[PDB]
Design an enzyme around this catalytic site. Structure first.
Site, PDB file in Angstrom:
ATOM      1  N   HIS A 506       1.055  -1.263   0.162  1.00 51.37           N
ATOM      2  CA  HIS A 506       0.058  -0.063   0.104  1.00 51.37           C
ATOM      3  C   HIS A 506       0.823   1.224  -0.016  1.00 51.37           C
ATOM      4  O   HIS A 506       0.437   2.400   0.401  1.00 51.37           O
ATOM      5  CB  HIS A 506      -1.146  -0.040   1.273  1.00 51.37           C
ATOM      6  CG  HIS A 506      -2.242  -1.000   0.970  1.00 51.37           C
ATOM      7  ND1 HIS A 506      -3.160  -1.144   1.945  1.00 51.37           N
ATOM      8  CD2 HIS A 506      -2.527  -1.737  -0.087  1.00 51.37           C
ATOM      9  CE1 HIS A 506      -3.664  -2.172   1.678  1.00 51.37           C
ATOM     10  NE2 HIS A 506      -3.298  -2.621   0.552  1.00 51.37           N
ATOM     11  N   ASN A 551      -7.359   0.776   2.087  1.00 51.26           N
ATOM     12  CA  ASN A 551      -6.689   0.199   0.708  1.00 51.26           C
ATOM     13  C   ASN A 551      -6.892   1.427  -0.273  1.00 51.26           C
ATOM     14  O   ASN A 551      -7.780   1.856  -0.475  1.00 51.26           O
ATOM     15  CB  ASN A 551      -7.199  -1.257   0.423  1.00 51.26           C
ATOM     16  CG  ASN A 551      -7.719  -2.244   1.377  1.00 51.26           C
ATOM     17  OD1 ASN A 551      -8.909  -1.736   1.830  1.00 51.26           O
ATOM     18  ND2 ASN A 551      -7.500  -3.115   1.424  1.00 51.26           N
TER      19      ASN A 551
END
Ligand SMILES: Cc1cc2nc3c(=O)[nH]c(=O)nc-3n(C[C@H](O)[C@H](O)[C@H](O)COP(=O)(O)OP(=O)(O)OC[C@H]3O[C@@H](n4cnc5c(N)ncnc54)[C@H](O)[C@@H]3O)c2cc1C
Ligand SMILES: Cc1cc2nc3c(=O)[nH]c(=O)nc-3n(C[C@H](O)[C@H](O)[C@H](O)COP(=O)(O)OP(=O)(O)OC[C@H]3O[C@@H](n4cnc5c(N)ncnc54)[C@H](O)[C@@H]3O)c2cc1C
Lengths: 576, 576, 52, 104
Positions: A506, A551
């Site tokens: 991420h 996310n």
């Protein structure tokens, strides 16, 4: 391959595909280049989990993931092997072996960071979780008018959700899902809300989910074609994009230098508009190899000429993980509504329930599956059907629990099937922390070491910042330990742990967005345009400049939709 | 989809593609069904290692392999986990869990056997080693005339080699290959001969090999098409083939029952000719589900009506493995022809050689690569160029060393990544033993347990036969220990070991060929025609009835070619 | 175990194993410093590491 | 059955045990430090030939036990160290420390 296009897009992941969908549809002549190849079924760039075999054997998909995640920066290995034969060739130093990076401090790395080079990028294997960010996690697109900023993000996200086919009801009739959801809803009644993870996916049958990917956003077929006779698009796989060539005034990109990996030849591609969507690490590499930022080890005694914030303020999330084994209580509660006659395997056995009894703790769709399972598999000691879909539960980031959560089952690189405990009992816990952007957290590129495609070697200098980031990470661990115990005890071999830095994939802020280059320490504006350059755009998680726990891909896509709006207003398609 | 074809083929591995290649080319209307899906990119059924990315990261390919190999028969797990939390749910027994096979004795299994369900079958992942069998390992095609038998095998193998593009030159300029080859040649002078492993592969460039696959045999495109306008072929992926239907007299097959996994539909497909090429496990499974052999635990008090030998006499090769780290003497010999002055990394350092010198141990091409490496990489302590291709050495099976050898590097499911030792130093050793066919060694199918595709569950009852097979397997282990020492000592973590039974994936004999059903205890004759049936043929390693050590696929291909000859002589293609 | 229990290693080189999964709140090393009885004089690649 | 084959090592001047003049051990004495590699030449050739001999001889009795496959053991684990105060007839000619009466 033409020499001239209206738009060239570097990378065929879901962000590149967002630019393709918008610009191809708006009538531009568009080429897209990817270093990797079509390797993925008839649907180009589609999710690799969308095969009958993977959905009958999901645990095997961890292998697919491992097979395409190539580590970004591996430090020089210092393991002592002192049991070689005396006749074998034996090292006198820990010299640079096997692709390792001598620039990399092993104690300030994101050793888990990796990249995928295949058409569709990481969307060929991703988990499809696509939550929105709340204000706290999100950069501003409108200054000094929160309601307006919120409206603009609502408009962008709504379009991104449509492109990815995000939904929150594909697992609504899973017993395991509702079991976990209902228990947590009750345990945190009036303190925290729980829901299905928003998932980019479409259910096709009770045992098959068509998980979204780049292909969903844009199907990557060359145009014009029967279905789109007035569109112009070409995808060129196995082409490494090496440089954007700046004019001397640093106001325009004049060409893209590429290397065709199959023939070995190099070419110079002209476009009106260049869009770099090569991922957070490789957009940065391509820029530094083009004269933006600073090549080599950071040296402040020397100002870079262009984009001095490039590669600084990087953020990667802290990730804590465990698995649990469902409690006896919760398993018992699955059959709470059942009436049980006789014994299993015997003429007398009977399991019943009354559709609609208001004394029932569960709905009819649930009791019917439990009854049927218990009556068709009398040798089985559990009440959960074999084909029951996996849980997909989250309580989204809030100021009082500032981490994202996923309480679920899915394949990731650090998957490990274990065979001893029944898989219906198992629930994965992943909590994801936000990381404050700090100038000292950097992705930089060697001026001497190169990677497998002969491009400057990425190096990290990263630590999780002290203060709020560290305090929150630890509170996040404790929250996972406390919340998970409501559902069951830890599974041995998957005890609560921090995961290797970067494994979460991420990474943000490597080419970060803001309103003013100098004031906001940034590289691109809110149109994702590189400051000073008329015709160069960047897309992806590298743009996000904030500390976020959720996310990031949906938020990246949204920025990308805003960027295409600028492009549509400022450049005119060539005549077809 | 049509109701009626000339030829239907079950499975799109390289054996089915052999039937397709022969029979589509001779003008038959052919359909081929595979239970798996297309997933090697635009070249259908191609080798998945043929990407730039995999050839730059070959160790990652082990994950691809693991991802697609599904274990045939997993016994019930009896691992004790006794550190669960007291609140977690636990059964009181080791119950049938997670797909395991309660029929399977864990101590008489081939636990390593696995199958792949993808278009191209196992050839999407294989090693591409295609040696010929010598007489000792080879079934007879002509009895009582050894030169007639020799000539027939030479003609078939030559054809097969052409289909697979087998060659022995693709690694001829690898320094590591020649270092090993030359040393072993010299050390066994007069006793054993060494050469390149014959490989189905075509070199594209010094850093890329196009590995062969099913696609190389037959490109699996539907026909007619521009390149083949008079040919007729349809491939149908995601179709499970379940049963062939016997007429009442057991003299002909009347149809093939299929299940379309995407729509759920079921159909009876009619053809003049039925060819089964679903692999050695699944061919057998299809036949037993169609009333050949005996369904269920073998029960001699109950002769089957048809093909009594089906699933008996199964052979799987013993496999021994290690890796070595090259000796200091060999590594120093790489540079024996060099004159090295000065100290590396200083501008006074030089490496030179004398081109053409009669006393040089190496050819000019080698010395040049050595020189260029050492001068351009003065920090590296080894003289082997970084992109030097892997070794690919063999001494083929002979009566005095009755095992196949591979002395090489390549990706297999048990690969284990290693980082502290330089990969240039490492060589893999795999020796393959031949296994005597014994009636007691069986593959059978449950009459109660079913697999993930709802077909009878495979069960093994296997041990390596005592006597010659066991004696040679140990002598083979010693041989590897002895031979490998000439090159280097073992690599810690890859010490000499037998591999899990069946991991070698060279299973044969499950539907074995012979001249006479009864005297030769077999299922098909030398045309690969099932005894009794005018129109049913089986292809693949299941046909091989002998004890063999070399890799079996080229031989199975050669049998398929012979089968096709019989089909051409006996069935007329329909008018196009 | 009795033998293990009384054999004390003679020279143990400085430990360079990477542990990168500690909690961000835990104290951590910026270097592989001399820790836990190790011998900074010892080249790990020229040792008799099993001597005790 | 356990198999342990023990090789001989040529005495070489460069193979040394020495003691730090700064680091001390748990009893406050100079810390021991090794500088050792198995000599090239005969010691190394013999060691590999010795591994090969164990593999050949062991196979006469049975195959290897998984998890106890043939390997070299960590240097020194054998605890058969010698030559650190070596004997000879003449201190200089035989490069030694004690005579044949073990007298320094
Ligand atoms: C197992 C897995 C689980 C994850 N789960 C989630 C999740 O649930 N939710 C979510 O939001 N995120 C998740 N992610 C992350 C998500 O996949 C990425 O954020 C996303 O794919 C980024 O999209 P992109 O288009 O910017 O880049 P990428 O998908 O990385 O695509 C970039 C592409 O550019 C190419 N390229 C790179 N360099 C060059 C060059 N020099 N020239 C030409 N082409 C180049 C690549 O080959 C690649 O195809 C997960 C990822 C993994 C691997
Ligand atoms: C990693 C690895 C390395 C190897 N190395 C080598 C080597 O170097 N040399 C060599 O000779 N051999 C090697 N092999 C073995 C080789 O790949 C096989 O021998 C060969 O592929 C067998 O060909 P086939 O066409 O008979 O069967 P397969 O390749 O197994 O194909 C059979 C096919 O039929 C399909 N199928 C199965 N059941 C059904 C059904 N009911 N209905 C419809 N379709 C069905 C499958 O999906 C499959 O595609 C290796 C294999 C692997 C996996």
């Amino acid at each position: 391959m033409d020499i001239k296009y209206d738009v060239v897009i570097v990378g065929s992941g879901p962000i590149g595909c967002t630019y393709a969908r918008e610009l191809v549809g708006a009538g531009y002549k568009v080429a897209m280049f990817d270093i990797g190849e079509i390797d993925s079924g008839l649907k180009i760039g589609a999710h690799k989990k969308n095969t009958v075999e993977y959905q009958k054997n999901i645990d095997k998909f961890v292998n697919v993931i491992q097979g395409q995640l190539m580590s970004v920066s591996v430090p020089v290995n210092t393991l002592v092997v002192d049991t070689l034969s005396p006749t074998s060739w034996q090292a006198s130093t820990f010299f640079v072996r096997n692709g390792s990076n001598p620039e990399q401090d092993p104690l300030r790395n994101l050793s888990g960071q990796a990249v995928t080079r295949v058409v569709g990028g990481m969307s060929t294997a991703w988990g499809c979780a696509t939550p929105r960010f709340d204000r706290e996690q999100r950069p501003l697109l409108v200054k000094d008018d929160a309601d307006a900023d919120d409206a603009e993000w609502d408009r962008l996200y709504t379009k991104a959700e449509s492109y990815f086919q995000t939904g929150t009801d594909q697992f609504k009739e899973s017993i395991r899902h509702n079991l976990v959801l209902n228990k947590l809803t009750e345990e945190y009644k009036g303190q925290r809300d729980f829901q299905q993870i928003p998932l980019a996916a479409t259910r096709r049958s009770p045992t098959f989910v068509e998980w979204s990917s780049a292909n969903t956003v844009f199907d990557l077929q060359n145009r014009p074609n029967t279905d789109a006779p007035e569109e112009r698009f070409n995808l060129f796989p196995a082409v490494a994009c090496e440089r954007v060539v700046r004019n001397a005034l640093n106001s325009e990109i004049e060409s893209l230098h590429i290397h065709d990996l199959i023939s070995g030849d190099r070419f110079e591609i002209k476009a009106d508009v260049y869009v770099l969507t090569a991922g957070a690490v490789h957009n940065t590499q391509l820029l530094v190899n083009s004269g933006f930022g600073q090549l080599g080890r950071p040296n402040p005694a020397n100002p870079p000429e262009l984009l001095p914030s490039l590669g600084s303020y990087i953020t990667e999330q802290s990730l804590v993980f465990c698995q649990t084994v469902m409690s006896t209580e919760l398993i018992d509660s699955v059959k709470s509504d059942m009436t049980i006659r006789g014994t299993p395997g015997e003429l007398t056995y009977s399991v019943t329930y009354t559709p609609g009894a208001s004394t029932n703790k569960h709905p009819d769709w649930w009791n019917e599956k439990v009854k049927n399972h218990m009556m068709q598999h009398q040798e089985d000691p559990l009440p959960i059907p074999f084909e029951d879909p996996e849980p997909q539960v989250t309580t989204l980031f809030q100021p009082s629990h500032p981490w994202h959560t996923q309480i679920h089952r899915d394949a990731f690189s650090y998957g490990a099937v274990q065979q001893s405990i029944d898989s219906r009992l198992i629930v994965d816990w992943r909590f994801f922390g936000r990381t404050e952007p700090k100038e000292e957290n950097k992705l930089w590129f060697s001026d001497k070491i190169t990677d497998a495609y002969n491009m400057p070697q990425p190096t990290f200098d990263f630590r999780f910042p002290a203060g709020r980031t560290s305090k929150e990470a630890e509170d996040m661990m404790t929250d996972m330990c406390v919340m998970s115990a409501k559902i069951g005890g830890f599974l041995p071999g998957s005890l609560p742990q921090f995961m290797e830095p970067g494994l979460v994939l991420h990474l943000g802020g490597t080419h970060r967005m803001g309103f003013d280059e100098k004031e906001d320490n940034c590289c691109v504006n809110t149109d994702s345009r590189v400051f000073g350059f008329k015709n160069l755009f960047l897309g992806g998680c590298g743009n996000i400049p904030t500390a976020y726990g959720a996310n990031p891909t949906l938020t990246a896509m949204s920025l990308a939709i805003k960027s295409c709006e600028y492009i549509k207003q400022n450049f005119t398609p060539s005549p077809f």
